[PDB]
Amino acid sequence: VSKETATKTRQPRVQMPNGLVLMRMMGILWHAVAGTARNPVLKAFWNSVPLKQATAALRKIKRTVSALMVGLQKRGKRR
Amino acid sequence: VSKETATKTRQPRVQMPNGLVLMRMMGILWHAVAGTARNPVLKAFWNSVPLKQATAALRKIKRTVSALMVGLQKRGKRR
């Protein structure tokens, strides 16, 4: 549920599947470095983030975002 | 100065340099879908934002952030 994902993002006890948490970790860090947001339990999990497994997601999820970006451009001109 | 940029994130009159404003657009836009925070300044910038040229610039930065993670791995084990 997208409505749920939006609520779970930046919410205490973000203990969810690895494939889901690793899809929000960098998002939070993006604003954490230059902005705000620093939850105790979040920090603990972040300090426990694997090395190789992190890069594996970095080179995967980011590609999908790029694919969709160009994908929508293919349907920019209809009719 | 991260402390200086921090208070500029999601702040009105965010007329930052090309590479700087893009970094903000690649952050707040994500939160706008997974939460909230939709400033007219960003909406206007995104409205007139390039399509084909965007993917290229974004991918360029996507590499750097991922390279940093791998770079830290080479310094995870000190002595």
From Swiss-Prot, chains A, B:
Reading the lineage from the top rank, the first entry is: Viruses
> Residues on the Cytoplasmic side?
1-79
Compartments reported by the entry: Virion; Host nucleus; Host cytoplasm, Host perinuclear region; Host cytoplasm
- What is the documented function of this protein? Plays a role in virus budding by binding to the cell membrane and gathering the viral RNA into a nucleocapsid that forms the core of a mature virus particle. During virus entry, may induce genome penetration into the host cytoplasm after hemifusion induced by the surface proteins. Can migrate to the cell nucleus where it modulates host functions. Inhibits RNA silencing by interfering with host Dicer.
Q: Describe its partners and assembly state.
A: Homodimer. Interacts (via N-terminus) with host EXOC1 (via C-terminus); this interaction results in EXOC1 degradation through the proteasome degradation pathway.
What is the name listed in the Swiss-Prot or TrEMBL entry for this protein?
A: Capsid protein C
> What lineage is this protein's organism placed in?
Viruses, Riboviria, Orthornavirae, Kitrinoviricota, Flasuviricetes
Tell me the part of the parent protein that is shown: 18 to 96 of 3414
